[PDB]
Amino acid sequence: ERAGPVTWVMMIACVVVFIAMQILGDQEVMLWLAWPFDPTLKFEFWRYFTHALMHFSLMHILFNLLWWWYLGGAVEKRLGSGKLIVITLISALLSGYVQQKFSGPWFGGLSGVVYALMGYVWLRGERDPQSGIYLQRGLIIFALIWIVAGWFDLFGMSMANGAHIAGLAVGLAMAFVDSLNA
């Protein structure tokens, strides 16, 4: 009982990327991994996802990865690799899209995906506890605090509020759908 392959690879990739940003600077890394910021870039398709891999401070990566580890790891063990992969891909594109829409292509990090995972895990537990999946009371509280910090901009998280809701909404939709089975 550890962190599965999707859980573990993402963490590794985010770390390696953060190191690359510490050495080359953020800008050089953004140049390569950010949402297409020019028409000439619109068919470099990794860019619609690789923005989620870049973090700008230690707070930012530390907390995103704690949540990812705990929640993404829970989803992966109890529900499967494919599920985590899908939640991640969809929440990444959507939050990316909204961010980009309201504020330009210069952003990054896994917090959109974390809002999806928070909404997914909380609502699956609410609607379908027998899945094995739920957010603990204590943790609802820490989640909520983490959300507040970002909503009221008490700590720098790269992405804006409309993008985090997009992320949340995706996680809610998917839990909804998933719990619609039984």
Curated annotation (Swiss-Prot):
It is found in: Cell inner membrane. Residues 73-78, 123-132 are cytoplasmic. It is a multi-pass membrane protein. The chain crosses the membrane at residues 4-24, 52-72, 79-99, 102-122, 133-155, 160-182. It is an enzyme of class 3 (hydrolase). The keyword GTP-binding does not apply. Changing N64A: Reduced catalytic activity. GO terms for molecular function: endopeptidase activity; identical protein binding; serine-type endopeptidase activity. Keywords: Cell inner membrane, Cell membrane, Hydrolase, Membrane, Protease, Serine protease, Transmembrane, Transmembrane helix. The active site is at S111, H164. Its EC number is 3.4.21.105. GO terms for biological process: proteolysis. The keyword Repeat does not apply. Residues 25-51, 100-101, 156-159 are periplasmic. One of its GO terms (cellular component) is plasma membrane. Its main location: membrane. It catalyses: Cleaves type-1 transmembrane domains using a catalytic dyad composed of serine and histidine that are contributed by different transmembrane domains. Belongs to the peptidase S54 family. Rhomboid-type serine protease that catalyzes intramembrane proteolysis. The loop between transmembrane domains 5 and 6 is flexible and may readily open to the extracellular side to allow water entry into the active site cavity. This is Rhomboid protease GlpG. It comes from Escherichia coli (strain K12). The gene is glpG.
